[PDB]
Each structure stands twice: as structure tokens, then as C-alpha cells.
Design an enzyme around this catalytic site. Sequence first.
Site, mmCIF file in Angstrom:
data_model
loop_
_atom_site.group_PDB
_atom_site.id
_atom_site.type_symbol
_atom_site.label_atom_id
_atom_site.label_comp_id
_atom_site.label_asym_id
_atom_site.label_seq_id
_atom_site.Cartn_x
_atom_site.Cartn_y
_atom_site.Cartn_z
ATOM 1 N N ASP A 185 0.795 -1.248 0.000
ATOM 2 C CA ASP A 185 0.000 0.000 0.000
ATOM 3 C C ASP A 185 0.818 1.284 0.000
ATOM 4 O OD1 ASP A 185 0.697 0.158 2.635
ATOM 5 O OD2 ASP A 185 -1.298 -0.503 3.452
ATOM 6 N N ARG B 204 0.962 6.702 0.165
ATOM 7 C CA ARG B 204 0.171 5.679 0.861
ATOM 8 C C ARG B 204 -1.221 5.672 0.320
ATOM 9 N NH1 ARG B 204 -2.834 2.515 3.234
ATOM 10 N NH2 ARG B 204 -2.640 1.796 5.381
ATOM 11 N N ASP C 124 -5.849 -1.073 3.753
ATOM 12 C CA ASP C 124 -4.711 -1.523 4.550
ATOM 13 C C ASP C 124 -4.321 -2.890 4.062
ATOM 14 O OD1 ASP C 124 -2.876 -1.353 6.669
ATOM 15 O OD2 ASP C 124 -4.215 -2.422 8.047
ATOM 16 N N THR C 125 -3.133 -2.970 3.547
ATOM 17 C CA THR C 125 -2.539 -4.253 3.219
ATOM 18 C C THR C 125 -1.760 -4.799 4.403
ATOM 19 O OG1 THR C 125 -0.655 -3.062 2.158
ATOM 20 C CG2 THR C 125 -2.401 -3.813 0.680
ATOM 21 N N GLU D 14 1.426 -6.181 6.432
ATOM 22 C CA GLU D 14 2.843 -5.848 6.323
ATOM 23 C C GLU D 14 3.573 -7.015 5.653
ATOM 24 O OE1 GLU D 14 4.107 -2.801 7.260
ATOM 25 O OE2 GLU D 14 2.047 -2.224 7.753
ATOM 26 N N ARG E 40 3.866 11.280 4.025
ATOM 27 C CA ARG E 40 3.441 10.480 2.865
ATOM 28 C C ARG E 40 2.254 11.101 2.167
ATOM 29 N NH1 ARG E 40 2.636 4.547 5.526
ATOM 30 N NH2 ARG E 40 0.959 5.850 6.487
HETATM 31 C C1 LIG Z 1 -4.140 5.516 5.104
HETATM 32 C C2 LIG Z 1 -3.838 6.642 6.103
HETATM 33 C C3 LIG Z 1 -2.976 6.362 7.165
HETATM 34 N N1 LIG Z 1 -2.727 7.366 8.088
HETATM 35 C C4 LIG Z 1 -1.827 7.095 9.281
HETATM 36 C C5 LIG Z 1 -2.696 6.362 10.359
HETATM 37 C C6 LIG Z 1 -1.745 5.382 10.997
HETATM 38 O O1 LIG Z 1 -1.009 6.066 12.049
HETATM 39 P P1 LIG Z 1 -0.102 5.167 13.028
HETATM 40 O O2 LIG Z 1 1.223 5.025 12.275
HETATM 41 O O3 LIG Z 1 0.091 6.028 14.254
HETATM 42 O O4 LIG Z 1 -0.771 3.856 13.277
HETATM 43 C C7 LIG Z 1 -0.759 5.064 9.866
HETATM 44 C C8 LIG Z 1 -1.192 3.765 9.169
HETATM 45 O O5 LIG Z 1 -0.357 3.531 7.969
HETATM 46 P P2 LIG Z 1 0.281 2.141 7.677
HETATM 47 O O6 LIG Z 1 -0.835 1.120 7.486
HETATM 48 O O7 LIG Z 1 1.104 2.410 6.412
HETATM 49 O O8 LIG Z 1 1.150 1.720 8.864
HETATM 50 O O9 LIG Z 1 -0.915 6.114 8.900
HETATM 51 C C9 LIG Z 1 -3.369 8.597 7.990
HETATM 52 O O10 LIG Z 1 -3.119 9.476 8.914
HETATM 53 N N2 LIG Z 1 -4.264 8.939 6.979
HETATM 54 C C10 LIG Z 1 -4.533 7.946 6.048
HETATM 55 O O11 LIG Z 1 -5.349 8.191 5.167
HETATM 56 CA CA LIG Z 2 -0.208 -1.439 5.918
#
Ligand SMILES: Cc1cn([C@H]2C[C@H](OP(=O)(O)O)[C@@H](COP(=O)(O)O)O2)c(=O)[nH]c1=O
Ligand SMILES: [Ca+2]
Length: 129
Positions: free
Chosen positions: A15, A29, A34-35, A37, A75
Amino acid sequence: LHKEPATLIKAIDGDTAKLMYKGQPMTFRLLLVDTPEFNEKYGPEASAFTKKMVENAKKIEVEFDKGQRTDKYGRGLAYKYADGKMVNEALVRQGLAKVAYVYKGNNTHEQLLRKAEAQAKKEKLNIWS
Ligand SMILES: Cc1cn([C@H]2C[C@H](OP(=O)(O)O)[C@@H](COP(=O)(O)O)O2)c(=O)[nH]c1=O
Ligand SMILES: [Ca+2]
């Protein structure tokens, strides 16, 4: 929403990928999914699916939603299209991502993706198997 150009710099995982957007390198991103890891079940399969889709595309495009365009990690947050096909949707339809992280004001394609998820689950694909 509008599609804008980007080019692939490198695949990362199911993702995220590094794209060049307005001539600058950025990690993007995928919105609303959510994919797993890479170290999780179906992680390697998600990473491979997105890698193929983005590396094989003649044209990559990013489409921002109405709200936040970058997250707290810097991102880019976008819907990504490979020769017109949405990667976010394609991952969900194959059971290689769940619909997730649906924040208000950045959820234009939520219902499209939930319909794909329902189909993946009905077919018991991958994460739903
Ligand atoms: C997809 C997305 C993730 N995020 C943040 C939430 C999560 O915070 P935390 O890192 O504190 O859990 C993290 C999840 O991404 P990942 O699934 O790439 O880890 O990215 C956003 O803020 N907005 C979004 O649209
Ligand atoms: Ca992920």
C-alpha cells in the site's frame, strides 16, 4: 476529483510506493485501504500485486481526495491508477487489502471499495479465505 501525473521511482509494499510527483520524490500511501505488512500473512502477496501493477503500467496517476493530501509521516495520500485501473480498488477486490482508515472528508471512493470488499469476501479470496 482529478487524476494527476506521477512516475514510479520504486515499489515498496502493498500500500505504499515511491513516486515522482510534480518532479519531487514522495512516498505515497493508498487511501482507504490496509494491506498486511510484508512480514504478515498475504503481505508478500500484496506487495507483489501492487509491484506488478505499478511496474507494468504505461501511465501512473495519483488522485487526491478533498481533504488532507499528506499524512503525519509526510506520505502522499491518494488513489493511485495504473493505466486507468485503481490500485486501491484492485487490491481490495482481490482480498489483498481491507477497507480501512476511512477518515471523514477523505472518503470519496469508500462505497466503491466496500463493494469490492464484499465481492472478495463472498469469493473467500486471500485474506478472506
Ligand atoms: C491511510 C492513512 C494512514 N494514516 C496514518 C494512520 C496510521 O497512524 P499510526 O502510524 O500512528 O498507526 C498510519 C497507518 O499507515 P500504515 O498502514 O502504512 O502503517 O498512517 C493517515 O493518517 N491517513 C490515512 O489516510
Ligand atoms: Ca499497511
